[PDB]
Write an enzyme that holds these catalytic residues in place. Structure first.
Site, PDB file in Angstrom:
ATOM      1  N   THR A  14     -24.059  19.191  46.778  1.00  0.00           N
ATOM      2  CA  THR A  14     -25.259  18.899  47.543  1.00  0.00           C
ATOM      3  C   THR A  14     -25.493  17.392  47.495  1.00  0.00           C
ATOM      4  OG1 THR A  14     -27.691  19.083  47.515  1.00  0.00           O
ATOM      5  CG2 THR A  14     -26.526  19.533  45.443  1.00  0.00           C
ATOM      6  N   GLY A  16     -23.096  14.972  46.166  1.00  0.00           N
ATOM      7  CA  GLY A  16     -21.919  14.126  46.175  1.00  0.00           C
ATOM      8  C   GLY A  16     -20.621  14.907  46.095  1.00  0.00           C
ATOM      9  N   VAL A  18     -17.228  16.178  43.811  1.00  0.00           N
ATOM     10  CA  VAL A  18     -16.780  16.448  42.448  1.00  0.00           C
ATOM     11  C   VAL A  18     -15.258  16.335  42.342  1.00  0.00           C
ATOM     12  CG1 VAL A  18     -16.888  18.008  40.469  1.00  0.00           C
ATOM     13  CG2 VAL A  18     -18.737  18.001  42.182  1.00  0.00           C
ATOM     14  N   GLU A  77     -18.219  18.206  31.478  1.00  0.00           N
ATOM     15  CA  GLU A  77     -17.104  19.021  30.994  1.00  0.00           C
ATOM     16  C   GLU A  77     -16.520  19.777  32.181  1.00  0.00           C
ATOM     17  OE1 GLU A  77     -17.722  22.783  28.899  1.00  0.00           O
ATOM     18  OE2 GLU A  77     -19.867  22.539  29.197  1.00  0.00           O
ATOM     19  N   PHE A  78     -15.231  20.056  32.107  1.00  0.00           N
ATOM     20  CA  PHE A  78     -14.502  20.690  33.203  1.00  0.00           C
ATOM     21  C   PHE A  78     -14.261  22.168  32.881  1.00  0.00           C
ATOM     22  CE2 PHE A  78     -11.534  20.988  36.659  1.00  0.00           C
ATOM     23  CZ  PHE A  78     -10.519  21.816  36.227  1.00  0.00           C
ATOM     24  N   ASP A  82     -14.615  28.464  39.638  1.00  0.00           N
ATOM     25  CA  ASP A  82     -16.000  28.708  40.038  1.00  0.00           C
ATOM     26  C   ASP A  82     -16.141  30.158  40.499  1.00  0.00           C
ATOM     27  OD1 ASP A  82     -16.148  29.002  43.079  1.00  0.00           O
ATOM     28  OD2 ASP A  82     -15.089  27.103  42.922  1.00  0.00           O
ATOM     29  N   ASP A 123     -30.880  24.887  42.958  1.00  0.00           N
ATOM     30  CA  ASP A 123     -29.634  24.979  43.724  1.00  0.00           C
ATOM     31  C   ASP A 123     -28.685  26.169  43.549  1.00  0.00           C
ATOM     32  OD1 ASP A 123     -28.309  24.036  45.984  1.00  0.00           O
ATOM     33  OD2 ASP A 123     -26.920  22.799  44.791  1.00  0.00           O
ATOM     34  N   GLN A 127     -20.791  28.745  44.017  1.00  0.00           N
ATOM     35  CA  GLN A 127     -19.996  27.522  43.824  1.00  0.00           C
ATOM     36  C   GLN A 127     -20.452  26.724  42.608  1.00  0.00           C
ATOM     37  OE1 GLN A 127     -20.006  25.294  47.595  1.00  0.00           O
ATOM     38  NE2 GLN A 127     -19.974  27.287  48.636  1.00  0.00           N
ATOM     39  N   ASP A 141     -24.044  21.710  38.124  1.00  0.00           N
ATOM     40  CA  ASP A 141     -24.453  20.986  39.321  1.00  0.00           C
ATOM     41  C   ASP A 141     -25.918  21.248  39.613  1.00  0.00           C
ATOM     42  OD1 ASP A 141     -23.039  20.690  42.723  1.00  0.00           O
ATOM     43  OD2 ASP A 141     -24.234  19.323  41.497  1.00  0.00           O
TER      44      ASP A 141
HETATM   45  C1  B49 Z   1     -14.619  28.076  47.248  1.00  0.00           C
HETATM   46  C2  B49 Z   1     -14.752  27.762  45.755  1.00  0.00           C
HETATM   47  N1  B49 Z   1     -14.678  26.398  45.346  1.00  0.00           N
HETATM   48  C3  B49 Z   1     -15.500  25.574  46.189  1.00  0.00           C
HETATM   49  C4  B49 Z   1     -14.879  24.464  46.969  1.00  0.00           C
HETATM   50  C5  B49 Z   1     -13.287  25.932  45.340  1.00  0.00           C
HETATM   51  C6  B49 Z   1     -12.627  25.587  44.027  1.00  0.00           C
HETATM   52  N2  B49 Z   1     -13.306  24.761  43.079  1.00  0.00           N
HETATM   53  C7  B49 Z   1     -13.272  25.106  41.657  1.00  0.00           C
HETATM   54  O1  B49 Z   1     -12.640  26.128  41.277  1.00  0.00           O
HETATM   55  C8  B49 Z   1     -13.994  24.212  40.621  1.00  0.00           C
HETATM   56  C9  B49 Z   1     -13.520  23.814  39.331  1.00  0.00           C
HETATM   57  C10 B49 Z   1     -12.190  24.212  38.678  1.00  0.00           C
HETATM   58  N3  B49 Z   1     -14.467  23.005  38.755  1.00  0.00           N
HETATM   59  C11 B49 Z   1     -15.533  22.870  39.640  1.00  0.00           C
HETATM   60  C12 B49 Z   1     -16.813  22.063  39.473  1.00  0.00           C
HETATM   61  C13 B49 Z   1     -17.262  21.619  38.066  1.00  0.00           C
HETATM   62  C14 B49 Z   1     -16.642  21.693  36.806  1.00  0.00           C
HETATM   63  O2  B49 Z   1     -15.398  22.216  36.515  1.00  0.00           O
HETATM   64  N4  B49 Z   1     -17.509  21.150  35.896  1.00  0.00           N
HETATM   65  C15 B49 Z   1     -18.699  20.708  36.554  1.00  0.00           C
HETATM   66  C16 B49 Z   1     -19.908  20.081  36.100  1.00  0.00           C
HETATM   67  C17 B49 Z   1     -20.924  19.767  37.021  1.00  0.00           C
HETATM   68  C18 B49 Z   1     -20.748  20.069  38.374  1.00  0.00           C
HETATM   69  F1  B49 Z   1     -21.670  19.788  39.280  1.00  0.00           F
HETATM   70  C19 B49 Z   1     -19.562  20.688  38.808  1.00  0.00           C
HETATM   71  C20 B49 Z   1     -18.553  20.991  37.882  1.00  0.00           C
HETATM   72  C21 B49 Z   1     -15.244  23.605  40.800  1.00  0.00           C
HETATM   73  C22 B49 Z   1     -16.137  23.719  42.007  1.00  0.00           C
END
Ligand code: B49
Length: 294
Positions: A14, A16, A18, A77-78, A82, A123, A127, A141
């Protein structure tokens, strides 16, 4: 960012973008969120620090904030997947009820914690919910629309999902309560169960009218004050409430009873995260491990 090697762009926020990123010194892998540049408020970065001191197993950890060179970087942290991706991957067989239940339970713990600390997500959506290999799920997020605030976008030409928005927001209330997060989480719970979005609006009014068609058009009886709200119009069509068993089959009665409480129109009648944790639906809760393809 020169401190960091982008592995990939893992989401479009929303606020920025990631990125999955690696630290050249530590070798730690993180999620890096970059925000668009006007003088970039002082007031914002204050209350981001409010997010930084939150520590809960169900809340994604914010590691650092970095304001340099007219963009804002949040280092998180990662996590490897999702919930949106997981639901899509599970669409054929569905997510097993015990796993749905553990996830809901953990998310409510996370929300109970945030809310007792006076932090709103605002939010919530699949996702924004992150899972790991050990069966944990975490709120991520946080959208805070104070402690910053609300754009109509993220960065460039990206289309905001209205599906999880509480009716009081759609009707133009200026002040959100913790109830808005319980609504969104209720919408998410239903979606895990049926494998379809509960209220998939394509516009603000279509979103509102989809809620009305299912739960009945609200009136002063169910929602005192509703007809006085800023965006309420007397000209709204009057739909009768659907039988609730049509809504989330085949969820059992404990699940439907809890969902109905998370979906109450009146933000004041809507169940709290704390009370939700005590619902009989969770009597048998366990912590199963998801089958995750990374
Ligand atoms: C359609 C589903 N997804 C949307 C594009 C596609 C794939 N995207 C994914 O799997 C995914 C992964 C593997 N990590 C994140 C995001 C974050 C994360 O790991 N730590 C955070 C801390 C704060 C924040 F704000 C986001 C994250 C995503 C969306």
């Amino acid at each position: 960012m020169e401190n960091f090697q982008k592995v990939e762009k893992i989401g479009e926020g929303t606020y920025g973008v990631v990125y999955k990123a690696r630290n050249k010194l530590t070798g730690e892998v993180v999620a890096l969120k970059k925000i668009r540049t006007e003088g970039v408020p002082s007031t914002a970065i204050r209350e981001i620090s409010l997010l930084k001191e939150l520590n809960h197993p169900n809340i994604v950890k914010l590691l650092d904030v970095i304001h340099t060179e007219n963009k804002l970087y949040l280092v998180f942290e990662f996590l490897h997947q999702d919930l949106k991706k997981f639901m899509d991957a599970s669409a054929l067989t569905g997510i097993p009820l015990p796993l749905i239940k553990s996830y809901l339970f953990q998310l409510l713990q996370g929300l109970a914690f945030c809310h007792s600390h006076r932090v709103l997500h605002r939010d919530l959506k699949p996702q924004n919910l992150l899972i790991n290999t050990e069966g944990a799920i975490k709120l991520a997020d946080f959208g805070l629309a104070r402690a910053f605030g609300v754009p109509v976008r993220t960065y460039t030409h990206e289309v905001v999902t209205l599906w999880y928005r509480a009716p009081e927001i759609l009707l133009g209330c200026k002040y959100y309560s913790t109830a808005v997060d319980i609504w969104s989480l209720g919408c998410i719970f239903a979606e895990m169960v049926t494998r379809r979005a509960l209220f998939p609006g394509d516009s603000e009014i279509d979103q509102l009218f989809r809620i009305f068609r299912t739960l009945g058009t609200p009136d002063e009886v169910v929602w005192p004050g509703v007809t006085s709200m800023p965006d309420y119009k007397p000209s709204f069509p009057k739909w009768a409430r659907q039988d609730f068993s049509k809504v989330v089959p085949p969820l059992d009665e404990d699940g439907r009873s809890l969902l109905s409480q998370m979906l109450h129109y009146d933000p004041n009648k809507r169940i709290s995260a704390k009370a939700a944790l005590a619902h009989p639906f969770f009597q048998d809760v366990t912590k199963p491990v998801p089958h995750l393809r990374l």
